[PDB]
Amino acid sequence: DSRTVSELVTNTNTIRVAMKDAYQRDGKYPDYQAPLSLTADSIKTDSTGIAVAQLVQLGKLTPDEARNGISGDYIGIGGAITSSGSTINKGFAMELNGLSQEQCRSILGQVGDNWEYVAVGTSPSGSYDALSAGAVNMLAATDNTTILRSLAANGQVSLTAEKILKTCTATVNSITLASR
């Protein structure tokens, strides 16, 4: 469903800018609070510190821009680290869950170059496996199948069509995008 993919791709850009704008004054980004309890009602009211709910409450996102229309979940957003021994979320990460191989490849080809960190996982609809385990390590080494691009030494990898074919190789795929 190309309309849904297109919407998610366009939204990814809006979320990136929203996060940078909202949390520039602070100098660091919020911890992950799962968005999996949110509904089309409570995206507008939730007070537990879920990033996408905060961006909606700030007017930076509409309620639908916060939602992954492929998985049916509100989009997961958590912290990311920018140095090896750090406890501070100097970056942020968003995860796009529940993607078929074809959806994953389409999205990667349309957004992957816009981010400093790009990883592919297998998080299903209903789960955010890349964010629920703590801040994302933006310095993870790149490899063929899972960490595509990162802030690591030699992590600035060109996301060629052939490299994208080497990933999203699972039945159910997910993409994690992170930035300073």
- The domains located in the chain, with CATH, are 1-180 (3.30.1690.10)
Q: Which residues, at least 6 apart from 102, have a Cβ–Cβ distance to it below 8 Å?
A: none
Alpha carbons 115 and 106: distance in angstroms, whole number: 16
Q: Element (H or E) spanning 23, and its range?
A: helix 2-23
Reported in sequence order, the residue ranges of the chain that DSSP labels E, i.e. its strands, are 76-81, 91-99, 117-121, 136-137, 147-149, 173-179
Distance of CA 108 to the CA centre of its chain: 12
Report H helices in 58-115: 101-111
Q: How far apart are CA 61 and CA 157, in angstroms?
A: 30
Resolution attained, angstroms: 1.3
Q: Can you list the positions of beta strands (E) in 40-163?
A: 76-81, 91-99, 117-121, 136-137, 147-149
Residue 178 pairs in a beta bridge with 93, 117
Name the CA dihedral angle for 62, 49, 67, 116, rounded to a multiple of 10 degrees.
100
Experimental method: X-ray
CB 117 within 8 A of CB 93: yes
Decide if 77 contacts 65 (C-beta within 8 A). Answer: no
* Spatial separation of the C-alpha atoms in residues 92 and 101, rounded to whole Å: 25
Three-state DSSP at 7 gives: helix
With a CB cutoff of 8 Å and minimum separation 6, the contacts of 71 are 96, 97, 98, 99, 124, 125, 126
- What does the alpha-carbon distance between residue 4 and residue 20 come to, in Å, rounded to a whole number? 24
Helix (H) or strand (E) run with residue 2 in it: helix 2-23
